[PDB]
């Protein structure tokens, strides 16, 4: 006959959600002086990750439907709106004309307006009214603007588990993306997670350590997105060959005269490395689909411009790169990009965040690690499966970094049938 | 606060019940929310401090934790002798405390003395 005894040091845990508090690396003190995107007075605590490997234990991770990505997406939106809020709202008909000096079709328009003057805009930020040109979302969405002294840029933002909770991680190199993970380890503070805020491609992402990883809830169903993680990143480089002044109570900012030749940023990517990466991707896909099905890579289907193009942040500006060339192949280097100022960033009505013009060239180098691929219909049985890129919901972009984490509440109290009475 | 619901009931019912027992920064009226959060954490910290002091008293009375603790000092006659049935069956805890409020200091002193004597004569042998 055994007796019940309760222990209060048991390491049993159970999954639960919790508002994780951000903590940027120490060196952010040197950058946060600029009031940048890089965190705020919202707990910039100095972290120190101390990994502790477990043993003989397998936990069932599920990166899909993982609350931490929703939590950190909400945190990022809160940080963005906190940075944007102190800045001045615009709240403004503009007479526009076609002006070009050495371009090439000219997107730029010389808009004019009378106040008690002249500026240059882009076709993507204005519509014809009845010539008369009015910038989009004029009477509906508070356009607002950003303070040019914020200079938003991504930074690592570690997540440290609260006092009573633990953050598990899957050290297994070839992580399936779901199911048991034989290589699990607790970690006080997550690694340098970075706010990529990029569409249809992943910039400054996390590299894998074996063949390019494929992951999705179903690879079968074509409704759910497909996340691809690279191993040999391909570089993307281009500038903003332009300069503009700042106009001026009537605290209104706009563009000015352009110095030098006018031409859109073409941007470049190594072609052989891109082909090799796509070959690795197709090799991995054949494993999940079959070693004989024809695979295709067409261009984005359409819809909002944020999903048709590849949108990314660069040096206080935003580039929308036509990505027809990169995803164009059928298996058995340059890509034009537009620029626009009003940014319906997180598909939210009422926010535009008019980007102030940048002065000079930037030449941001950004090396790609991840793809978002959405399949096509499966009417053609075993004939072909096309993989047009798409997406745009940033939850995927952040699930690319939080696939190897899970918050667990420690349940120290436990019972056991030992041989001892009182 | 929180455990006021059981008030007004019989000591039997009260004893049985006690035995069983990411916000963004876009919210409107932020100052009221943060001030009332300050107040709520003040309340919770004062609650944990009051609980710690009460547990220290229970420990000095030889009970440590526990809720229904039993001791060894007899119930004196002067402390409002009444029939136990009507004490524990009809009236409520608030009225009982109002009735015994005049004597609680003597109760605590006798309880501490009894526990100290129990410790002394238990460590004696």
């Amino acid at each position: 006959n055994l007796w019940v005894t309760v222990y209060y040091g048991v390491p049993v845990w159970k999954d639960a959600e919790t508002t994780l508090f951000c903590a940027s690396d120490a060196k952010a003190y040197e950058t946060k002086k600029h009031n940048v995107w890089a965190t705020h007075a919202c707990v910039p605590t100095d972290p120190n990750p101390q990994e502790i490997h477990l043993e003989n234990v397998t936990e069932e991770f599920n990166m899909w439907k993982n609350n931490m990505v929703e939590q950190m997406h909400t945190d990022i939106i809160s940080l963005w709106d906190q940075s944007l809020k102190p800045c001045v709202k615009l709240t403004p008909t503009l007479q526009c004309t076609n002006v070009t000096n050495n371009i090439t079709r000219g997107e730029l328009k010389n808009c004019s307006f009378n106040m008690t003057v002249y500026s240059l805009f882009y076709r993507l930020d204005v519509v014809q009214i009845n010539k008369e040109y009015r910038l989009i979302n004029c009477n509906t969405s508070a356009i607002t603007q950003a303070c040019p002294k914020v200079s938003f840029e991504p930074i690592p933002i570690h997540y440290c588990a609260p006092a009573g909770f633990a953050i598990l991680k899957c050290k297994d190199k070839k992580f399936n993306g779901t199911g048991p993970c034989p290589s699990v380890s607790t970690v006080q503070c997550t690694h340098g997670i970075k706010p990529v805020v990029s569409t249809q491609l992943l910039l400054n992402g996390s590299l894998a350590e074996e063949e390019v990883m494929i992951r999705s809830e179903n690879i079968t169903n074509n409704a759910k997105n497909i996340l691809v993680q690279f191993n040999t990143p391909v570089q993307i480089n281009c500038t903003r060959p332009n300069n503009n002044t700042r106009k001026s109570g009537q605290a209104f900012y706009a563009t000015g005269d352009i110095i030098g030749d006018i031409r859109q940023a073409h941007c470049n990517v190594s072609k052989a490395t891109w082909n090799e990466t796509l070959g690795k991707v197709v090799k991995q896909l054949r494993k999940h689909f079959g070693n004989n099905t024809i695979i295709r890579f067409a261009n984005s289907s359409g819809g909002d411009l944020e999903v048709t193009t590849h949108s990314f942040n660069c040096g206080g500006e935003f580039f929308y790169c036509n990505t027809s060339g990169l995803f164009n192949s059928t298996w058995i280097i340059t890509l034009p990009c537009r620029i626009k100022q009003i940014i319906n960033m997180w598909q939210r009505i009422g926010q535009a965040m008019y980007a102030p013009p940048i002065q000079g060239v930037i030449r941001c180098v950004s090396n790609i690690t991840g793809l978002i691929l959405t399949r096509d219909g499966g009417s053609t049985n075993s004939t072909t499966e096309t993989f047009r890129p798409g997406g745009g919901d940033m939850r995927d972009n952040w699930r690319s970094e939080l696939y190897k984490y899970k918050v667990v509440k420690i349940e120290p109290l436990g019972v056991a049938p030992t041989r001892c009475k009182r | 606060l929180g455990f006021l619901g059981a008030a007004g009931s019989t000591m039997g019912a009260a004893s049985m019940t006690l035995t069983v027992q990411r916000a963004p920064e876009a919210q409107q009226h932020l100052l009221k929310l943060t001030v009332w959060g300050i107040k709520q954490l003040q309340a919770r910290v004062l609650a944990v401090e009051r609980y710690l002091r009460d547990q220290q008293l229970l420990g000095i009375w030889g009970c440590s934790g526990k809720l229904i603790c039993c001791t060894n000092v007899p119930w004196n006659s002067s402390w409002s002798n009444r029939n136990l049935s009507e004490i524990w069956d009809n009236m409520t805890w608030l009225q009982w405390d109002k009735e015994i409020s005049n004597y609680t200091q003597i109760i605590y002193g006798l309880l501490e003395e009894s526990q100290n004597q129990q410790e002394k004569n238990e460590q004696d042998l």
């Epitope: 959600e17 439907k65 609350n67 929703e70 939590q71 909400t74 939106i77 074509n222 409704a223 759910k224 997105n225 984005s300 289907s301 359409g302 819809g303 909002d304 944020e306 999903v307 048709t308 319906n344 598909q347 939210r348 009505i349 959405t374 399949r375 096509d376 219909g377 096309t386 047009r388 798409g390 997406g391 745009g392 919901d393 939850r395 | 990411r22 916000a23 963004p24 876009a26 919210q27």
Partner: antibody, heavy 123, light 111 residues
């Protein structure tokens, strides 16, 4: 499986706030997006608003920003729609639905709709 | 941007009907979704539909429902019409965070 069931007043006189409560069973624990939609009689339906079940962030149609407020209740798995200053033209069949979390090539759809409740504005 | 579509259409039982949804000029390559609302029952999500006819699927719907695309037009084709097809089918899209709905095709079957 997600089930939406809505209720509220059937007859509402002009010029006050109309309150409609939609409860949900079997919805995801968090990260959900609950949307209120209405269809005026004999005219194409229009979107009213939507609430993020976790963040608490709301959003509304630009032409109904002031008159519409959507609140959530995680404890009872419910959300409340309040339409301030209802007019005679706001009579409609109201649906509470859940908008998906896939964003397939630039669409958000409402897989799970409510049964619909008819609200008529009369004397 | 308005989702122009035919107000009414009908066909005999057991035949195939082809409901149409025409996008505006500014929504040439936009992808849409089809919604079916029977009499009294809650609206039921049917299928998405993109520029090249690549359409998703959902459980609980008959396989007879099919989608197709042609430039600025999207066609919902139904084969082997039943009595339960008495309904209203409308097309919906998402340009910005604001949804845009069609007028609703009242589709009826003949007994």
């Amino acid at each position: 499986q997600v089930q939406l069931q809505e209720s509220g007043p059937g007859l509402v006189k002009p010029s006050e706030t109309l309150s409609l409560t939609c409860a949900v069973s079997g919805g995801s624990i968090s990260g959900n997006y609950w949307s209120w939609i209405r269809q005026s009689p004999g005219k194409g339906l229009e979107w009213i608003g939507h609430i993020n079940d976790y963040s608490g962030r709301t959003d509304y149609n630009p032409s109904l920003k002031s008159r519409v407020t959507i609140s959530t209740d995680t404890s009872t798995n419910q959300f409340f729609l309040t339409l301030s200053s209802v007019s005679a033209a706001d009579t409609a069949v109201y649906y509470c639905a859940r908008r998906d979390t896939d964003f397939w090539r630039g669409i958000y759809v409402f897989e799970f709709w409510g049964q619909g409740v008819l609200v008529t504005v009369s004397s | 941007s308005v989702l122009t579509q035919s107000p009414s259409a009908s066909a005999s039982l057991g035949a195939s009907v082809k409901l149409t949804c025409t996008l505006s000029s500014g929504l040439r390559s936009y992808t849409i979704a089809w919604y079916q609302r029977q009499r009294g029952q809650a609206p039921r999500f049917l299928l998405r539909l993109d520029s090249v006819g690549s359409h998703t699927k959902v459980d609980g719907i008959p396989d007879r429902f099919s989608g197709s695309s042609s430039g600025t037009e999207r066609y919902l084709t139904i084969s082997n019409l039943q009595s339960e097809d008495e309904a209203d089918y409308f097309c919906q899209t998402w340009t910005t965070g604001i949804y845009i709905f069609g007028g609703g095709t009242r589709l009826s079957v003949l007994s």
